[PDB]
Design an enzyme around this catalytic site. Sequence first.
Site, PDB file in Angstrom:
ATOM      1  CB  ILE A   1     -20.985   1.152 -22.190  1.00  0.00           C
ATOM      2  CG1 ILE A   1     -21.734   0.295 -20.921  1.00  0.00           C
ATOM      3  CG2 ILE A   1     -21.416   2.373 -22.250  1.00  0.00           C
ATOM      4  CD1 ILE A   1     -21.864   0.984 -19.451  1.00  0.00           C
TER       5      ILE A   1
ATOM      6  CE  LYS B   1     -23.176  -6.746 -15.160  1.00  0.00           C
ATOM      7  NZ  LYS B   1     -22.089  -7.339 -14.280  1.00  0.00           N
TER       8      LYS B   1
ATOM      9  CD  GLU C   1     -20.264  -9.318 -26.417  1.00  0.00           C
ATOM     10  OE1 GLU C   1     -19.030  -9.598 -26.491  1.00  0.00           O
ATOM     11  OE2 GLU C   1     -21.041  -9.650 -27.311  1.00  0.00           O
TER      12      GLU C   1
ATOM     13  CG  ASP D   1     -18.058  -7.846 -12.153  1.00  0.00           C
ATOM     14  OD1 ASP D   1     -17.966  -9.001 -11.875  1.00  0.00           O
ATOM     15  OD2 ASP D   1     -18.962  -7.698 -13.201  1.00  0.00           O
TER      16      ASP D   1
ATOM     17  CD  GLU E   1     -22.054   4.864  -7.917  1.00  0.00           C
ATOM     18  OE1 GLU E   1     -22.061   3.949  -7.192  1.00  0.00           O
ATOM     19  OE2 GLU E   1     -20.989   5.928  -7.966  1.00  0.00           O
TER      20      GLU E   1
ATOM     21  CB  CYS F   1     -18.040   4.034 -12.850  1.00  0.00           C
ATOM     22  SG  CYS F   1     -18.198   3.524 -11.083  1.00  0.00           S
TER      23      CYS F   1
ATOM     24  N   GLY G   1     -24.722 -10.693 -21.146  1.00  0.00           N
ATOM     25  CA  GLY G   1     -25.378 -10.045 -22.207  1.00  0.00           C
ATOM     26  C   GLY G   1     -24.931  -8.661 -22.294  1.00  0.00           C
TER      27      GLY G   1
ATOM     28  CG  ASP H   1     -12.878 -12.147 -10.840  1.00  0.00           C
ATOM     29  OD1 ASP H   1     -11.756 -12.511 -10.989  1.00  0.00           O
ATOM     30  OD2 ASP H   1     -13.975 -11.926 -11.459  1.00  0.00           O
TER      31      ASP H   1
ATOM     32  NE  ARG I   1     -10.701 -10.505 -14.540  1.00  0.00           N
ATOM     33  CZ  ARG I   1      -9.749 -10.818 -14.231  1.00  0.00           C
ATOM     34  NH1 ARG I   1      -8.648 -10.428 -14.762  1.00  0.00           N
ATOM     35  NH2 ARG I   1      -9.451 -11.930 -13.312  1.00  0.00           N
ATOM     36  CG  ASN I   2     -13.924  -7.635 -11.814  1.00  0.00           C
ATOM     37  OD1 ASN I   2     -14.465  -7.932 -13.034  1.00  0.00           O
ATOM     38  ND2 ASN I   2     -13.322  -8.926 -11.417  1.00  0.00           N
TER      39      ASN I   2
END
Length: 256
Positions: free
Chosen positions: A15, A39, A17, A149, A85, A87, A21, A131, A135-136
């Site tokens: 899903i 991950k 990068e 994240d 978990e 999302c 990894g 952060d 994006r997180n």
Amino acid sequence: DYEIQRERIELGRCIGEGQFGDVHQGIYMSNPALAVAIKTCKNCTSDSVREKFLQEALTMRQFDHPHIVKLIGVITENPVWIIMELCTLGELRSFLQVRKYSLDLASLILYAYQLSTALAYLESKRFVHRDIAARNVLVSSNDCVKLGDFGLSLPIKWMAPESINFRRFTSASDVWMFGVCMWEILMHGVKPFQGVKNNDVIGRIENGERLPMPPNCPPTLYSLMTKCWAYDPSRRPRFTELKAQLSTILEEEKAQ
Ligand SMILES: CN(c1ncccc1CNc1ccnc(Nc2ccc3c(c2)CC(=O)N3)n1)S(C)(=O)=O
């Protein structure tokens, strides 16, 4: 015991990068079979890489909140994996871009409110994230987002001036970042300061310039963003007040 046996994990589709990894979707059969995000870590044979990769799991272990992604467990034999978990609806930025003309303003304010409850919870534990950015954030359902994240992936265009100038990261600097995150949500996943060089952001902020009011953003919500962007960290609100003010704004929008 967060150590998961690999035979209980069924690795599925890639899903995205991550910094370490590829990230996959999968199944964890404990309790009936559950949906999980896995991950992976390309170079975790190296102890230094492994320690940095697995630090996110150590950090996430500490939290229990409805709007923070849950850590399921870790597999620390090569290949090293972190199980979380899932999302199912993915990244908030892509979700907002794709659903732009179908999502109502009430939904955008609800996402800002849910994120404010997760951040009020982290503030209550004296945890500084460093952060906060769209994006997180991940999307669990059309009416549920989660902070997803804690890996610490320089995000100059989101950073508080004291973080850029002195590398100081505090509860007040997280509020500045949360203001940028709220702007991103109301902009339907557009990044802040597009086209501006990172070293020029600093100067514009010092000059009193701020991100403009997003189209159709309620003036009350923009006023709240401007409070998050006080140059003086001591003048920024705390998350208890941000959460209460967002709840009022959400109810005002629901009523229309
Ligand atoms: C996207 N990635 C992420 N970005 C930001 C935060 C976290 C992750 C990956 N971690 C998690 C944790 C829990 N749920 C999901 N869900 C999910 C994330 C993408 C997608 C789908 C679900 C479905 C889909 O198509 N994409 N991802 S990334 C760049 O690869 O690290």
